[PDB]
Amino acid sequence: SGFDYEGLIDSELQKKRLDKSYRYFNNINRLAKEFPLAHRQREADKVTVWCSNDYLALSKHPEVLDAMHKTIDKYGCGAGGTRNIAGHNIPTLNLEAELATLHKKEGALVFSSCYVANDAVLSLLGQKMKDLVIFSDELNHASMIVGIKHANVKKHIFKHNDLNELEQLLQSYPKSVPKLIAFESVYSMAGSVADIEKICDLADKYGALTFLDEVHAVGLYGPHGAGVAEHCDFESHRASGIATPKTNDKGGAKTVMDRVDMITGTLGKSFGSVGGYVAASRKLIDWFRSFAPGFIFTTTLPPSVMAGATAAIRYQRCHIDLRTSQQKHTMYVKKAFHELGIPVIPNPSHIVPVLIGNADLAKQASDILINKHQIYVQAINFPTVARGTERLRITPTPGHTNDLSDILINAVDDVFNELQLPRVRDWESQLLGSNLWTSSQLSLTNDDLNPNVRDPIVKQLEVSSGIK
Amino acid sequence: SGFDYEGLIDSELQKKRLDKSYRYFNNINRLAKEFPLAHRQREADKVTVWCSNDYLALSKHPEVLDAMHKTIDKYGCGAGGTRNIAGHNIPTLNLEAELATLHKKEGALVFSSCYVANDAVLSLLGQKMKDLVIFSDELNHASMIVGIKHANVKKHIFKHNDLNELEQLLQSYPKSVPKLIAFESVYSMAGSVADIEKICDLADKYGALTFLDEVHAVGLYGPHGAGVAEHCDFESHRASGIATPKTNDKGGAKTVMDRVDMITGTLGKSFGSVGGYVAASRKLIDWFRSFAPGFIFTTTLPPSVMAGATAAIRYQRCHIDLRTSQQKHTMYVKKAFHELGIPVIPNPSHIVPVLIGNADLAKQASDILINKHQIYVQAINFPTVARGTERLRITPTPGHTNDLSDILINAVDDVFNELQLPRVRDWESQGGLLGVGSNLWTSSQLSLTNDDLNPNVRDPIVKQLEVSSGIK
Ligand SMILES: Cc1ncc(COP(=O)(O)O)c(CNCC(=O)O)c1O
Numbered sequence A: 001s002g003f004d005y006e007g008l009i010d011s012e013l014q015k016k017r018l019d020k021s022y023r024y025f026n027n028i029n030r031l032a033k034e035f036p037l038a039h040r041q042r043e044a045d046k047v048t049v050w051c052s053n054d055y056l057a058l059s060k061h062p063e064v065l066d067a068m069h070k071t072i073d074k075y076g077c078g079a080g081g082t083r084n085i086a087g088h089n090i091p092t093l094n095l096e097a098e099l100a101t102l103h104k105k106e107g108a109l110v111f112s113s114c115y116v117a118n119d120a121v122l123s124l125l126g127q128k129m130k131d132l133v134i135f136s137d138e139l140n141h142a143s144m145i146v147g148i149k150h151a152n153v154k155k156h157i158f159k160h161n162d163l164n165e166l167e168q169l170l171q172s173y174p175k176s177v178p179k180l181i182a183f184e185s186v187y188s189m190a191g192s193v194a195d196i197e198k199i200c201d202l203a204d205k206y207g208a209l210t211f212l213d214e215v216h217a218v219g220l221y222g223p224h225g226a227g228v229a230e231h232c233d234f235e236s237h238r239a240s241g242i243a244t245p246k247t248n249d250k251g252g253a254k255t256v257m258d259r260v261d262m263i264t265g266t267l268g269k270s271f272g273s274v275g276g277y278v279a280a281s282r283k284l285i286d287w288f289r290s291f292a293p294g295f296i297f298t299t300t301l302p303p304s305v306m307a308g309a310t311a312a313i314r315y316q317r318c319h320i321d322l323r324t325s326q327q328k329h330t331m332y333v334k335k336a337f338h339e340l341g342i343p344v345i346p347n348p349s350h351i352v353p354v355l356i357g358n359a360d361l362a363k364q365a366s367d368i369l370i371n372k373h374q375i376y377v378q379a380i381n382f383p384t385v386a387r388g389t390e391r392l393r394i395t396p397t398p399g400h401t402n403d404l405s406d407i408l409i410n411a412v413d414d415v416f417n418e419l420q421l422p423r424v425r426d427w428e429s430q431l432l433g434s435n436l437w438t439s440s441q442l443s444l445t446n447d448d449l450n451p452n453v454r455d456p457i458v459k460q461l462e463v464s465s466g467i468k
Numbered sequence B: 001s002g003f004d005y006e007g008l009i010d011s012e013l014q015k016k017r018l019d020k021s022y023r024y025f026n027n028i029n030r031l032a033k034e035f036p037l038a039h040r041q042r043e044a045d046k047v048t049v050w051c052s053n054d055y056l057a058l059s060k061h062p063e064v065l066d067a068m069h070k071t072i073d074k075y076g077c078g079a080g081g082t083r084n085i086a087g088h089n090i091p092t093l094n095l096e097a098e099l100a101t102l103h104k105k106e107g108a109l110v111f112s113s114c115y116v117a118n119d120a121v122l123s124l125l126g127q128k129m130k131d132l133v134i135f136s137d138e139l140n141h142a143s144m145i146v147g148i149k150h151a152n153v154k155k156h157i158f159k160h161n162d163l164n165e166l167e168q169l170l171q172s173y174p175k176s177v178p179k180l181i182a183f184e185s186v187y188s189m190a191g192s193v194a195d196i197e198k199i200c201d202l203a204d205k206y207g208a209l210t211f212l213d214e215v216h217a218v219g220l221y222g223p224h225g226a227g228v229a230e231h232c233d234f235e236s237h238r239a240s241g242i243a244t245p246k247t248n249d250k251g252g253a254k255t256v257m258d259r260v261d262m263i264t265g266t267l268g269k270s271f272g273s274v275g276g277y278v279a280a281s282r283k284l285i286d287w288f289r290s291f292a293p294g295f296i297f298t299t300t301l302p303p304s305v306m307a308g309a310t311a312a313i314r315y316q317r318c319h320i321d322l323r324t325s326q327q328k329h330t331m332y333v334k335k336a337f338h339e340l341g342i343p344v345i346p347n348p349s350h351i352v353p354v355l356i357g358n359a360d361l362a363k364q365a366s367d368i369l370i371n372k373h374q375i376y377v378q379a380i381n382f383p384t385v386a387r388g389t390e391r392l393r394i395t396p397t398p399g400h401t402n403d404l405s406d407i408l409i410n411a412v413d414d415v416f417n418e419l420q421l422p423r424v425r426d427w428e429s430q431g432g433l434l435g436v437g438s439n440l441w442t443s444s445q446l447s448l449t450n451d452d453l454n455p456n457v458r459d460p461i462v463k464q465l466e467v468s469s470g471i472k
């Protein structure tokens, strides 16, 4: 007999168990009628979910559900084909148009997932420019890492958010060498934020494209939820609404969001659905549409799923109260943790990473929270984060009111004592250690938005179907 | 001064226009209440869709829609996370269990899409066995090609369905070399079918894994729609229903479907939804679950989308009349075309590829069909097929009854005259092409009804798999 395939797999699975990164998924059945509750195996066994990426609770929004129900009745479930063959349609057109409008770009292209979007764009760039050099933040997501490998070009990794190191790398190449700077706006495991504007400045100076993943930012930053790039020119964007502003927030001609060449997002988090996208110039979009195999050779997302996301995007654009209440909830939890010496990785975003520092203790903390306190928070271990930096990821939403927060705070405090986990004081004696939303921005209401953001009559893009 | 990025893209887009493979997508709005009709830009402007991969018309089935509606009311739209974080749930468990049941495997794992499934499995195998040699059918789908590139291992391409050439390639390595044979059951562009059994025999003899893409076969072949692998032991599977058969169709211990190491499918065709999967041993599934980044680091499909597919799978398992009526519809169209000398690439499957032979004429035929006859059929050109072999792809379903077929036949006949396209006779004069000049479903199999299935397929109490969540 030949190779021992079963032996190779056995030993590979055993390494996961011995190093204790072997994952057990929790049966979590999220309740649309009782957000943010979920049930486990039994309907009667409920927990409060504190680690979902349904950041704005739009997965259960009436306009999202209604859009789904109506679309299902008209279109059915599946698209029934690919974009080329029988799977191109009005829900697709409306969604691409909505995303392009959100990022104030010429075009947007929808993919199965942002994982696929990231892989497709990065792969194609590298496969069509073999001389390309990619500069990648060390904390970039798996999707981007995989895309960068697939691109199959020279790559440099820079220390996280270290723009001195990035500039030194950029500088060591002639300007005429094609370059790509690949980064995220908000890094999900730490909640850290990129200086998008400074990166755009570096791109201008050294002749690089910019690729920006706003997956943990869309819905959440900027007056309309277009992301951190929008937040960079918050007041310009707020004044102009849907329109491109006359000037950026410093009185210059171009906004940050305009200067970024390629912006990717998800429909699977804030926008309450599933899918991915890239927003960019008409030329870039047409190129991806025409050449990306991960776009071309795959069933189109169901119409209903697209209709849902479109509804979510439209609603959130003109409901800044979603963001203000999320930020308030987050800040409430963060300040309560600070007072109790519960160690939170400091960040200016909506993510609350509670530092544990140990794989087994993080899993046990998660275990006790769900079984004893009916709180669902997931442990983040290697390989998603560095060994020794293990943590619990907590993500408050507009639905996590202060009464629910109080229960969380009490439970986490309690679990820290039960496991005798290190407090902030203890960490100081012995790691990974200031808010994007300002008080000014946090006191805005929906009345302070440009009325042109309420039910815009958004027209379909020619590029979605092909250009004459 | 800086690289001309816009220049590179412009010239790249211009190559598509000059070679005339630059695609214009049709606005096709499929109507659940009026299958297989769709509207274009205006609701009033309707066409009949004849090139959908909604092969069993289950995208609009009441049990599918009802499953979606109820799931949406309970769960909402999005999963709200990945499988690891807040996106693992009962709809997921039920779907994976249903797929494992269908293929009579220990486990199944759901992905965003079969494109992603294929890429993930192939990538991982090659990344974890760098000495692996992959033997790949020349007509394998882009997803598999890309997966095989990503695997980043030695690859041999064998001529399409040529198991003599495959054997000679396999033979030129010692048995102890790790090997993978990657192939499809049904190839969508001409409807050809693999000899899965002979490939399993070659894998046994030369010590290879088998990777089988049944994307154009699930729902459609075998008594329960488990695919061509099931069709290989049709009678054993039919007798045993959902249970593993006592013997295969030759009286041996193991069925072909059991001997295939990895089977991938889609939820986006027959099963009327979206998504992909692999069915395999518990060990393999646990491995993909634990290691495939394309599985791990992506939002879970919406619960409703999973619930829809589950309903579609359960329904089709015990409705063999879906397959018999599809095959009859296909055979009706094929034989009508034969009588009219409309050239169809001969195949034993459910696909009707009408040979045009010219890129411009195929697009014009498609154009005239939709604008003049309200028939939507897509032209297939280079690079999807060889230049000179361009064609129209027609895919009948249970919903394409003979009245609709008659309209299609009439329209295609009409278009052939309008464009003075070559008939079968005309191709024969030039020496034939691609067989223009049997059948998986036999007469015996085609006269089976739902009463001839094992009752254990009706409402199986399918139990959730431990491997879906993790094994201790
Ligand atoms: C930063 C980031 N980028 C891209 C993706 C992929 O997008 P989709 O989920 O639409 O496939 C994820 C998903 N993973 C979420 C997480 O890292 O917690 C992500 O977190």
Ligand SMILES: Cc1ncc(COP(=O)(O)O)c(CNCC(=O)O)c1O
Pocket: A082, A297, A298, A299, B113, B114, B115, B116, B118, B141, B143, B184, B188, B213, B215, B216, B265, B266, B267, B268, B274, B275, B276
């Ligand atoms: C043979 C084959 N394999 C895999 C896939 C990918 O499946 P998803 O659509 O679920 O990603 C497809 C898609 N069908 C493309 C075509 O008919 O050319 C396919 O045809």
